[PDB]
Amino acid sequence: AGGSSPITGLVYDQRMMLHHNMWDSHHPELPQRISRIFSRHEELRLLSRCHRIPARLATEEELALCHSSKHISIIKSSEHMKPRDLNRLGDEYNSIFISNESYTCALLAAGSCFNSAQAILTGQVRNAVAIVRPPGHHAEKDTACGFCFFNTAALTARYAQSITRESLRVLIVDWDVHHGNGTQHIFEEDDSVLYISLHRYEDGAFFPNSEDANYDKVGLGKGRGYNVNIPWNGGKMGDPEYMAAFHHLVMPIAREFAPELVLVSAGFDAARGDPLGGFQVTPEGYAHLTHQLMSLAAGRVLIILEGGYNLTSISESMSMCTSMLLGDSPPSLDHLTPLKTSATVSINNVLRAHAPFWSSLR
Numbered sequence: 420a421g422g423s424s425p426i427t428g429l430v431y432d433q434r435m436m437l438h439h440n441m442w443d444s445h446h447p448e449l450p451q452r453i454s455r456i457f458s459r460h461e462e463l464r465l466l467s468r469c470h471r472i473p474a475r476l477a478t479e480e481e482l483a484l485c486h487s488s489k490h491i492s493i494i495k496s497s498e499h500m501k502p503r504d505l506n507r508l509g510d511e512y513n514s515i516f517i518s519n520e521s522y523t524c525a526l527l528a529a530g531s532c533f534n535s536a537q538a539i540l541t542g543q544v545r546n547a548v549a550i551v552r553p554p555g556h557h558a559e560k561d562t563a564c565g566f567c568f569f570n571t572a573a574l575t576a577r578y579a580q581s582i583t584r585e586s587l588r589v590l591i592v593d594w595d596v597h598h599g600n601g602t603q604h605i606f607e608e609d610d611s612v613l614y615i616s617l618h619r620y621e622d623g624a625f626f627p628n629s630e631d632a633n634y635d636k637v638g639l640g641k642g643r644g645y646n647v648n649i650p651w652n653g654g655k656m657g658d659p660e661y662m663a664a665f666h667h668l669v670m671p672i673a674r675e676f677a678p679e680l681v682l683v684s685a686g687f688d689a690a691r692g693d694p695l696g697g698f699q700v701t702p703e704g705y706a707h708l709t710h711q712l713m714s715l716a717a718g719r720v721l722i723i724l725e726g727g728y729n730l731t732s733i734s735e736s737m738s739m740c741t742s743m744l745l746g747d748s749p750p751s752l753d754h755l756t757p758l759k760t761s762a763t764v765s766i767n768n769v770l771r772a773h774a775p776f777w778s779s780l781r
């Protein structure tokens with residue numbers, strides 16, 4: 420009564436470390452990714468400031484919100500498979516490794532986010548951070564892809580609608596350096612879930628190597644205008660470019676959409692130091708992206724870990740985000756390189772594509 424200071428949730432469970440690559444212990448999608456981030460939260464005295472949200476398993480019925488019965492069944496069967504067959508099954512997909520613990524970990528990643536979304540939407544917490552693996556955004560309705568088995572962010576959007584209202588407007592912002600092909604396709608015809616992705620594109624030569632990630636992909640049917648791809652070509656982008664895309668595109672569209680819940684597909688592989696992305700976003704940059712998103716949806720933001728492969732970089736970057744969620748003042752941008760010419764070209768292409776659908780851009 421009379422109001423109270425908002426609460427930030429945090430979910431992290433050591434069981435999700437059990438998923439591993441038994442043939443290549445140096446695969447970039449390391450168990451230590453989540454434990455290193457969690458450990459960094461302890462060092463910075465952030466953990467004791469958060470309300471700890473328990474993990475749980477997703478149910479098979481919940482997985483069916485976005486995935487086919489065949490795909491659920493095949494991944495489910497892998498918990499009991501012998502080593503020879505786990506390799507063959509993983510090799511049936513584009514860049515997937517599987518262990519006997521993989522299925523359970525994917526359930527825990529989804530269920531952790533379901534509990535966090537439920538806590539946000541019932542007012543137990545204002546916002547939350549989800550330190551989960553394996554990632555989700557490359558997972559399609561009928562197939563796994565790119566280290567992802569089930570589409571955690573997409574599943575969380577549908578779960579939120581199931582416990583509130585079907586038309587509940589969910590914004591998913593995907594700032595992982597890779598395009599979230601799976602999230603886009605699930606919602607491509609859906610005007611109740613706005614998907615905005617920023618990603619390295621290089622004319623379709625960057626993973627996942629599909630022209631579906633280009634700016635002219637605006638959605639289908641009633642979903643026209645509700646899929647916003649911001650593709651980067653020719654240059655290692657960093658804080659200046661992401662701040663410009665947010666100023667000119669992400670925030671105007673989002674504010675016009677007026678989301679009631681914000682999910683962040685928060686990969687940190689666009690971070691300085693990341694050997695898969697080649698970009699230059701700093702921890703302070705991620706903090707400012709988080710702070711701008713906190714102005715939406717009455718502050719109902721859920722940050723879901725996706726990719727990010729430099730353990731030091733992801734730990735500092737993700738901890739910067741939680742600090743913002745807790746209400747700390749955003750840090751000053753040390754460096755401020757003039758923006759790249761090619762980032763303006765990309766931004767202007769998206770503007771000319773989405774101006775027919777959004778008055779805030781005209």
Ligand SMILES: O=C(NO)c1ccc(C[N+]2=c3ccccc3=[SH]c3cccnc32)cc1
Nearest residue numbers: 447514565566597626686688695725726727
């Ligand atoms: O989910 C990601 N990030 O968040 C993600 C998903 C798939 C890939 C594919 N893959 C790999 C795959 C395994 C180990 C190292 C690499 S390097 C690379 C370069 C160019 C194309 N594919 C590549 C990469 C990243």
Ligand SMILES: [K+]
Nearest residue numbers: 593595597617
């Ligand atoms: K992305």
Ligand SMILES: [K+]
Nearest residue numbers: 606609612645
């Ligand atoms: K959409």
Ligand SMILES: [Zn+2]
Nearest residue numbers: 595597688726
């Ligand atoms: Zn990625």
